Design a protein around this ligand. Sequence first.
Ligand SMILES: CCCCCCCCCCCCCCCCCC(=O)OC[C@H](COP(=O)(O)OCCN)OC(=O)CCCCCCCCCCCCCCCCC
Lengths: 67, 309
Amino acid sequence: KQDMPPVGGYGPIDYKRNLPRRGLSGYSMFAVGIGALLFGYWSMMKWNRERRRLQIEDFEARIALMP
Amino acid sequence: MFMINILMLIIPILLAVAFLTLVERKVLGYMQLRKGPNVVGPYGLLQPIADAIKLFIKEPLRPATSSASMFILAPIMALGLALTMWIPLPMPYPLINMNLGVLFMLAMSSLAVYSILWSGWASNSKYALIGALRAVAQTISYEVTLAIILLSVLLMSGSFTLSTLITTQEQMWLILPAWPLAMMWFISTLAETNRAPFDLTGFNVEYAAGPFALFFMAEYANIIMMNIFTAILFLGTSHNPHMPELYTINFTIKSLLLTMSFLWIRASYPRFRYDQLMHLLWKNFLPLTLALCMWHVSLPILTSGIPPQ
Ligand SMILES: CCCCCCCCCCCCCCCCCC(=O)OC[C@H](COP(=O)(O)OCCN)OC(=O)CCCCCCCCCCCCCCCCC
C-alpha cells in the first residue's frame, strides 16, 4: 500500500529559452566611444604644449651659458 | 656592487613564475567549483617546491635519431634572450638607461621565432618537421601587427626612450586615446606568446624531464614580460621622487591583474582552426592598423600638439 504517486505539488520548470538583458544597443553605443576618445585628445595640447614650454625652458639654460 | 643587483633580479624573478603554476591552477580551480592544492600545502604553497625536484631526478633519455649540438642549443638561447629582455626596464629605475629601448624589446623578441625552428627541425620526422614549421609561420605574421601600432603611440608620446614615457603619462592612462589600439595590442601579444585561443602550438613531446622544464620555464618568462611591457606603456602609474617605494607598490600590482587575464581568457574560449587564424590578420586586422597609423600623424599636426624632444 506504500507506493509513490503524490497527490499534488508540481511546477513545472520551463522549457522556455530567453534572457534578453540588453544592454544599451542601437546608436547608444559608438556614442560613449567617440566622446571619450576626443576627451583623451582634449587632454593633449594642455600637456604636450605645456611640456613644449618647458622644453624651450630646458634649452634656455644651455644657450644662456657657454660663452 | 653592480653584480649583486644582477643576482637580485635574475633569481627573484624565477620564483615569480615558479610560484605561478600553482596560481595557474587555483584560479583555474575556483571557476570549476573546486579547491586548490589541499594535501601538500596546506594552502598549496608547498606544492611546486617538491615538483621542481622531480624533473631533475627523472632520467632524460636522448634521441638517437638527432644531433646533440643542435638539440641542447635551443634551451641555451631560451633562457638567454628571454631573460635579457628584462634588463632596460624601469621600476622606476631601469638597470640600464638605454637611449632607445622600445626598438630593443622588438629586436630581442624577433629572435623568439628563431628558437622554435631549431628543436622541431634537428630532432625528427613529420610532426617535428612539418608541425613545427607552421608555428613560426603564424608568429612571423605578428610582428607587422605588433610594430606598426607600436609606432603610432611614439608619435604622441615623443621619442624612443622609456624614461620619458612615465612623465608623459602622469595624468592620462593613455588607453583613453588608444582604446581601439588596446584591443589590437593585447590580442596580438596574446597570439605571439602561444596561448589558449591562438594555439596550434612535436617541439615539446621529445623533451624528457631535463630540458622540457626550460622551455616550460622560458615560455612563462615571456608571459609576465608582455604583461610588464604593456604595464609601462598603456597603464602608466604615478611617480614620486621623494618616495620611490610607492611607485613599485602600485606598479607590479597592476601588472599582476593583467597576468590573471591570460589565465582568465584561457577558461573561456576554443581554438581558431589554423586557416582562419592567419585569415583574421591580413583580411581583418591589418587594414584597420594602417588607418589608425594615418590617424596618429595628422591629429598631433592638426592640434599644434607635437610632443617635444
Ligand atoms: C570615425 C571616428 C574615428 C574612428 C573611430 C572608430 C572606432 C572603431 C574601433 C574599432 C577598433 C576595434 C575593432 C578592431 C577589429 C576587431 C577584430 C574583429 O572585429 O574581427 C571580427 C572577427 C572576425 O570574424 P567576422 O569578420 O566578424 O565574421 C563573422 C561574422 N558573423 O569576429 C569576431 O567578432 C571575433 C572577435 C575576435 C576573436 C578574438 C576574441 C578573443 C577575446 C579577446 C578579448 C579582448 C578583451 C579586450 C582587450 C583587452 C584590453 C587590453
